[PDB]
Tab-separated table of C-alpha atoms in Angstrom:
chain	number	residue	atom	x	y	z
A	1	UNK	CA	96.120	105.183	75.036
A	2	UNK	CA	99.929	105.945	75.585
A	3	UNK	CA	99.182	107.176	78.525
A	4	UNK	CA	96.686	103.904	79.250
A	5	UNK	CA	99.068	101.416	78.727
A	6	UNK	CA	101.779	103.474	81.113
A	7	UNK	CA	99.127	103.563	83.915
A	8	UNK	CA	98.449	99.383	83.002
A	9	UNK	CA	101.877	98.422	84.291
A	10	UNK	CA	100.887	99.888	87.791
A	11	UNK	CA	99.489	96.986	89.481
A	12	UNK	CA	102.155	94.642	87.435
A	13	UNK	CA	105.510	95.777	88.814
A	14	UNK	CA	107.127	94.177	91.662
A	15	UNK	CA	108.296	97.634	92.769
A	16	UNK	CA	105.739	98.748	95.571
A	17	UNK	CA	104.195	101.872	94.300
A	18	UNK	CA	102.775	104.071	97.337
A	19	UNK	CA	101.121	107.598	95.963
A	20	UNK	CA	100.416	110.355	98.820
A	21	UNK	CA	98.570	113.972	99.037
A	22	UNK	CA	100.289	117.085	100.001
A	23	UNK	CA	98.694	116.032	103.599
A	24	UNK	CA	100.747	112.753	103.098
A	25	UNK	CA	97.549	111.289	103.035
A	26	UNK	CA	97.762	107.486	101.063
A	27	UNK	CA	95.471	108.406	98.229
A	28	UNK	CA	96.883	104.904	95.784
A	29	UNK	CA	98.506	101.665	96.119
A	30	UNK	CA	99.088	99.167	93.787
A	31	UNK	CA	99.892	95.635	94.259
A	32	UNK	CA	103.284	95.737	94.429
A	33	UNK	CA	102.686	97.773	97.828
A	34	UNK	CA	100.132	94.968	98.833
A	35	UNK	CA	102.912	92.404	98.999
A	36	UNK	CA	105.629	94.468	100.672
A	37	UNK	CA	103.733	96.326	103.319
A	38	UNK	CA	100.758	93.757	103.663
A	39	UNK	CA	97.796	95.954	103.543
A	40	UNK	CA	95.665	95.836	100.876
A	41	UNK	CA	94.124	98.567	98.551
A	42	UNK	CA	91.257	99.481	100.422
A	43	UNK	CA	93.092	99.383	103.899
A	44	UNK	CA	96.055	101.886	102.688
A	45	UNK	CA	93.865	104.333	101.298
A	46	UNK	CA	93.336	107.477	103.227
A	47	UNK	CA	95.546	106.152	106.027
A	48	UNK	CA	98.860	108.512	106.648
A	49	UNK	CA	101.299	107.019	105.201
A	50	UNK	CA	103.881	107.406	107.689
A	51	UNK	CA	101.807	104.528	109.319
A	52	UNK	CA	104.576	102.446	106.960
A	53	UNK	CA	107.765	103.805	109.651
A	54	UNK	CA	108.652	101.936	112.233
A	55	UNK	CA	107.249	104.637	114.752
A	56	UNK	CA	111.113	106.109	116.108
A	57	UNK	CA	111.666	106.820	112.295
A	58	UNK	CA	108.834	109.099	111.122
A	59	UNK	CA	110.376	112.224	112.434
A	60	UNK	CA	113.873	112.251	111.385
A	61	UNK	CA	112.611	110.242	107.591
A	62	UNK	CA	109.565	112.835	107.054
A	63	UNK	CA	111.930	116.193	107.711
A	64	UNK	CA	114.601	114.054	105.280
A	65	UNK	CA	112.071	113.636	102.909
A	66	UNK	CA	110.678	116.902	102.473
A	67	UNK	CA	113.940	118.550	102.588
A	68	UNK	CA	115.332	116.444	99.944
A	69	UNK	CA	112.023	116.545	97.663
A	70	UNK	CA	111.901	120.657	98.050
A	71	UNK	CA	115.518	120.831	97.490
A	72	UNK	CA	116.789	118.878	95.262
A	73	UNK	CA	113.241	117.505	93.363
A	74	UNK	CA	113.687	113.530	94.685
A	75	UNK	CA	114.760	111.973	97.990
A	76	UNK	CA	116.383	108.230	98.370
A	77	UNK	CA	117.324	106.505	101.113
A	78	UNK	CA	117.618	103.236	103.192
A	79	UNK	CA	114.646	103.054	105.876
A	80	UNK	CA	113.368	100.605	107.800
A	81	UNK	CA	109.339	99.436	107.370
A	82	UNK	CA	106.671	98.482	109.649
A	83	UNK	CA	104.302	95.041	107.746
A	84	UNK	CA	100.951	95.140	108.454
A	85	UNK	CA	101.700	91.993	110.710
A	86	UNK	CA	104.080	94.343	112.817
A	87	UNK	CA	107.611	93.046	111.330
A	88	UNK	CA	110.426	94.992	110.713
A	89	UNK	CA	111.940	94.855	107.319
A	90	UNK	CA	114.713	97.557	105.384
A	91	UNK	CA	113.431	98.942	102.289
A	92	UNK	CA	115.139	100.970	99.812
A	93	UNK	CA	112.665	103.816	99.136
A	94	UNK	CA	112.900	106.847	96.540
A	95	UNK	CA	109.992	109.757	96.874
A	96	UNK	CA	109.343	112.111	93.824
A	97	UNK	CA	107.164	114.914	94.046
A	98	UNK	CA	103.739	115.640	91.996
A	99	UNK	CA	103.007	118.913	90.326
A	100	UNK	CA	100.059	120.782	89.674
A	101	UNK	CA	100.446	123.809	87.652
A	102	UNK	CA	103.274	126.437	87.614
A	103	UNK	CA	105.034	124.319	89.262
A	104	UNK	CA	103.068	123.401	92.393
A	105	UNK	CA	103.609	120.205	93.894
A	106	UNK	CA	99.993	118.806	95.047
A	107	UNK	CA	101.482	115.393	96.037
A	108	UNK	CA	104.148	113.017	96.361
A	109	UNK	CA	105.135	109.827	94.456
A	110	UNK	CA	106.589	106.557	96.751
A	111	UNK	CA	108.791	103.651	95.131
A	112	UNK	CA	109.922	100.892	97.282
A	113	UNK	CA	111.851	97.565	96.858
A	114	UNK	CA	112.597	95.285	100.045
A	115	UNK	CA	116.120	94.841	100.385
A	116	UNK	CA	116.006	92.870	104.257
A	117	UNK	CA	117.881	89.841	103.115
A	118	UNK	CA	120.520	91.870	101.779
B	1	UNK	CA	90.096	109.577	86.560
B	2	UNK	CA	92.757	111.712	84.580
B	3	UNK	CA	94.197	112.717	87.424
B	4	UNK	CA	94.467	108.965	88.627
B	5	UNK	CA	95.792	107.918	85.044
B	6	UNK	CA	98.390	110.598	85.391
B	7	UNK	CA	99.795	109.887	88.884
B	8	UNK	CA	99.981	106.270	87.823
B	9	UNK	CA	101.649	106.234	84.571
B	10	UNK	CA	103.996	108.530	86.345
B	11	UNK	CA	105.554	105.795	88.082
B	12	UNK	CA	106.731	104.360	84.687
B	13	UNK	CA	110.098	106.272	84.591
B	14	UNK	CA	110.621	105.934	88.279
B	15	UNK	CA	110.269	101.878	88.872
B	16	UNK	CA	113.038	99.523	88.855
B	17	UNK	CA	111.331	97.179	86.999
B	18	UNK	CA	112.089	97.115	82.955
B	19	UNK	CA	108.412	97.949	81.521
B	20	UNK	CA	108.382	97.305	77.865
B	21	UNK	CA	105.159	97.688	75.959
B	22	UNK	CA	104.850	96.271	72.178
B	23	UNK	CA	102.637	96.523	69.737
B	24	UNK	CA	100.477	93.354	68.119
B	25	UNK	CA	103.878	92.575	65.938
B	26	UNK	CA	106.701	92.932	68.896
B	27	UNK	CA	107.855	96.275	67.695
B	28	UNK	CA	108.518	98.578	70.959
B	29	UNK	CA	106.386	101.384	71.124
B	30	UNK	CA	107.089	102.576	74.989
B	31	UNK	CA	110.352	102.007	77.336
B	32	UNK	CA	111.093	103.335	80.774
B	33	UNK	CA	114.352	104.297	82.414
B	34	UNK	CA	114.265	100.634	83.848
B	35	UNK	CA	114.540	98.785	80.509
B	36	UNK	CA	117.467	101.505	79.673
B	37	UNK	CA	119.511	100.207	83.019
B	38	UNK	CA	118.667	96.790	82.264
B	39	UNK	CA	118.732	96.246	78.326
B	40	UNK	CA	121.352	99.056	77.724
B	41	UNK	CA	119.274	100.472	74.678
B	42	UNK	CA	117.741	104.307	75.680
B	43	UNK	CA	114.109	104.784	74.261
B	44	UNK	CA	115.637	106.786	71.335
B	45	UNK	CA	117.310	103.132	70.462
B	46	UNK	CA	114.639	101.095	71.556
B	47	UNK	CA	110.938	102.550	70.695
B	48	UNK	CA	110.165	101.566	67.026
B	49	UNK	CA	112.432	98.357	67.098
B	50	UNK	CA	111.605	94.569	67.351
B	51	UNK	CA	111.373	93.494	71.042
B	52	UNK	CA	113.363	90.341	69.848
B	53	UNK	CA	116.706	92.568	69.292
B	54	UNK	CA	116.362	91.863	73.143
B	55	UNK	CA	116.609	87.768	72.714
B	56	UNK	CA	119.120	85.674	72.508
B	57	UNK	CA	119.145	85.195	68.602
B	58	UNK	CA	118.499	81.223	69.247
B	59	UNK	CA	115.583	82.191	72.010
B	60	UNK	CA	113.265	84.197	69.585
B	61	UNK	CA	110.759	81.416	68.186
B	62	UNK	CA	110.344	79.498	70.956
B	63	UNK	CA	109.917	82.636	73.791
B	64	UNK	CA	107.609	83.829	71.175
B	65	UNK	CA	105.637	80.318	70.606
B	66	UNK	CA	105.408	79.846	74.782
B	67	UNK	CA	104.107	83.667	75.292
B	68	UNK	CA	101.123	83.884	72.671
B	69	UNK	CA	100.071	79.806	73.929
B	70	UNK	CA	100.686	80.984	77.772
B	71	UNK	CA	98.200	84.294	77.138
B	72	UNK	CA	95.824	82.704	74.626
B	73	UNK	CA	95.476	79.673	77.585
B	74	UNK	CA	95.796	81.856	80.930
B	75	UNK	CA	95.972	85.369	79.492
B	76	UNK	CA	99.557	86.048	80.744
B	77	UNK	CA	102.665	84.813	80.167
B	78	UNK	CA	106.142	84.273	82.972
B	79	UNK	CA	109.280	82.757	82.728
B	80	UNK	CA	112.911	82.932	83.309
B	81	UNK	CA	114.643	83.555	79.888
B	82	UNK	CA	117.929	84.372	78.667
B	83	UNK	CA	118.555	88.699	77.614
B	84	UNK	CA	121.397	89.683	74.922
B	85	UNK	CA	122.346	93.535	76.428
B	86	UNK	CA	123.241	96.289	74.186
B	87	UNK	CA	126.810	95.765	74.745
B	88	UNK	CA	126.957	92.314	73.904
B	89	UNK	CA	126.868	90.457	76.976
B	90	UNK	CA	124.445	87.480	77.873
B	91	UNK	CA	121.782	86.931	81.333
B	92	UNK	CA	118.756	86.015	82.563
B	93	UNK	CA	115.628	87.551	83.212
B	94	UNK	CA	112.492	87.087	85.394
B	95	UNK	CA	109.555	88.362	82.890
B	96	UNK	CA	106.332	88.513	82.556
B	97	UNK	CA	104.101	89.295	79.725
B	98	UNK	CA	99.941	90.452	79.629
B	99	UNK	CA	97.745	91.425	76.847
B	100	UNK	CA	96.983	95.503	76.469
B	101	UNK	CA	93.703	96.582	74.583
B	102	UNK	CA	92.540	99.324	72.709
B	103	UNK	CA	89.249	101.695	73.575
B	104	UNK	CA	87.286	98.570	71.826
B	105	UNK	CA	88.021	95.390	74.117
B	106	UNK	CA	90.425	94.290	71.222
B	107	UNK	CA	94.161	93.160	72.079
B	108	UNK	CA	96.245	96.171	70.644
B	109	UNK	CA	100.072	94.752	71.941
B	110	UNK	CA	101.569	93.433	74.791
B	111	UNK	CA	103.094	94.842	78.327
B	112	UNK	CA	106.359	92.776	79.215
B	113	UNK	CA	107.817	93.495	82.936
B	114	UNK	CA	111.217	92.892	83.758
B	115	UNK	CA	113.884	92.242	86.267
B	116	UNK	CA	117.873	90.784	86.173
B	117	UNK	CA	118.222	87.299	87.769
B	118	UNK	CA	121.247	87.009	85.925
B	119	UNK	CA	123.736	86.621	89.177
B	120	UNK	CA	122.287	83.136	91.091
């Protein structure tokens, strides 16, 4: 119910809504994600989701990430993103983590807004 | 499915976009850190209130009119409306409004999404 109608606004937001594994493993997408990035539901899903960095990123963004998410419980941060069509594009991106029980983070939670114009 | 439910609704307080959920009468029965930067109102001041404290008071009747014809025609409603802040101040908004239903296939309230267009 409550929590029904919180789920609902998922594929409604214009915020791109990218949920990973503790594998970083894409495991949802909503719609929002389908118009920023490109790929759709079914193409996302169980693809790493560092597949989203332009390739020179990952490395210095996942260590930032993980740091920031063990650390202080939420990273943010101006990247750039790869499209699906292979364009480059600056996205302002915020990662929260997922917990399990007693504490145990099982997963990670992505929110991204496209911010190239700007 | 839980566990899908769970990760998804968890996005709610995280989004930038102003999610506002109503019940079959306009009275706000969720709100997400997004409405609170946008609106001004935290859920302590908004949950249990009429969504239309949020209008313009001249806006009310015919944003109201336009969303129940746009949903019982298409089944959702968008537009670019005016938004009266907590602090007084006047803007615009892009919104968008859907039906949400109960365990029974019956229309229970509404979901509104928001974002300030207000500048341009």
């Amino acid at each position: 119910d409550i929590l029904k109608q919180r789920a609902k606004a998922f594929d409604y937001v214009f915020d791109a809504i990218v949920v990973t594994d503790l594998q970083g493993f894409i495991i949802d997408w909503n719609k929002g994600s389908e118009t920023l990035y490109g790929y759709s539901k079914e193409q996302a899903i169980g693809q790493p989701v560092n597949m989203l960095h332009v390739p020179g990123d990952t490395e210095h963004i996942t260590s930032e990430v993980i740091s920031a998410v063990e650390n202080q419980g939420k990273w943010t941060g101006e990247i750039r993103m790869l499209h699906k069509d292979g364009h480059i594009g600056w996205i302002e991106s915020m990662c929260v983590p997922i917990y399990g029980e007693n504490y145990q983070m099982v997963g990670a939670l992505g929110i991204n807004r496209d911010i190239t114009k700007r």
